[PDB]
Amino acid sequence: KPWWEDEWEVPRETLKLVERLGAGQFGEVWMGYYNGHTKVAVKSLKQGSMSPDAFLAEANLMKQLQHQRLVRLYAVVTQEPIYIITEYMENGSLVDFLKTPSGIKLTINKLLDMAAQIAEGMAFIEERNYIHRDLRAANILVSDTLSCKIADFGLARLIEDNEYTAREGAKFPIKWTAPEAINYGTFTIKSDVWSFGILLTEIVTHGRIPYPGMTNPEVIQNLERGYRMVRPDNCPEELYQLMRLCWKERPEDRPTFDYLRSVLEDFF
Numbered sequence: 152k153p154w155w156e157d158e159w160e161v162p163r164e165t166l167k168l169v170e171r172l173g174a175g176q177f178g179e180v181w182m183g184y185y186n187g188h189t190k191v192a193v194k195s196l197k198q199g200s201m202s203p204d205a206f207l208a209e210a211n212l213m214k215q216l217q218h219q220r221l222v223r224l225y226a227v228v229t230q231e232p233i234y235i236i237t238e239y240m241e242n243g244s245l246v247d248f249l250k251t252p253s254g255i256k257l258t259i260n261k262l263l264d265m266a267a268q269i270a271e272g273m274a275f276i277e278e279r280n281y282i283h284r285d286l287r288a289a290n291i292l293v294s295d296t297l298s299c300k301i302a303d304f305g306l307a308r309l310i311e312d313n314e315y316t317a318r319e320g321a322k323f324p325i326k327w328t329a330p331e332a333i334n335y336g337t338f339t340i341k342s343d344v345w346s347f348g349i350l351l352t353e354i355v356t357h358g359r360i361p362y363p364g365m366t367n368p369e370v371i372q373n374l375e376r377g378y379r380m381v382r383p384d385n386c387p388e389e390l391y392q393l394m395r396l397c398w399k400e401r402p403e404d405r406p407t408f409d410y411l412r413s414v415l416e417d418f419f
């Protein structure tokens with residue numbers, strides 16, 4: 152099928168990829184320019200590491216799950232080497248942006264609005280009957296207008312295994328993962344709600360790492376004891392209490408992203 156019949160497919164020629172943001176054991180991620188006028192992020196598949204159709208499976212969801220609060224698919228190149236292209240965000244990821252001087256200037260009101268947007272897109276993902284699995288500030292992109300786009304960069308499969316590790320379990324961010332996911336490998340949307348609560352502490356603490364003063368092993372040990380993160384300084388007790396709802400022990404007792412979105416929106 153001709154590429155101009157499609158809304159996504161573009162001739163590889165339209166792409167001048169310039170910098171290698173991050174390569175792994177399934178392909179690289181470059182920054183480059185589409186027809187010279189737009190800068191874009193380009194995910195490429197390396198041959199052999201996986202099915203061409205398995206790579207495209209992602210691109211395909213992105214077509215189907217378009218939404219203002221999701222990172223929007225920009226273009227795709229199907230032939231090998233395969234590219235998935237989105238647009239580049241000069242503000243970067245939420246966790247990065249928060250630590251910038253302009254990020255640190257953000258008001259609690261603006262922070263809460265971004266949280267609301269993140270909840271909003273998660274609510275859409277829930278509504279479309281998917282989950283995220285790695286919902287945290289590192290997979291959130293900040294737009295030019297300072298709104299938040301939910302991304303999934305495949306952060307986990309992006310790290311190369313070393314001589315010292317041989318886990319054949321699951322891969323997940325210890326400090327963001329609900330205990331039922333840690334213990335029983337059961338990841339659900341309610342599992343993402345947990346992550347969202349931890350994400351909230353990142354938002355309200357300039358992108359600070361969760362569970363300050365605890366190693367990932369320590370974190371898991373304390374989770375077994377029912378331990379919950381301490382309310383970040385200056386973080387409003389009400390917001391914290393909202394976090395505590397995201398960290399209910401039983402996943403079904405945790406709010407929905409709709410409720411989260413709602414509470415967040417009319418918070419002030």
Ligand SMILES: Cc1ccc(NC(=O)c2ccc(CN3CCN(C)CC3)cc2)cc1Nc1nccc(-c2cccnc2)n1
Nearest residue numbers: 192193194222235237239240243281282283284302303304
């Ligand atoms: C180049 C690319 C290719 C694919 C994607 N895809 C996604 O971001 C994504 C988002 C949501 C889902 C939904 N998914 C449903 C299933 N569950 C299990 C997970 C979530 C899937 C993929 C993004 C990008 N964009 C991207 N990638 C890496 C870095 C950047 C980037 C851009 C600007 C500034 N800095 C970094 N941008």
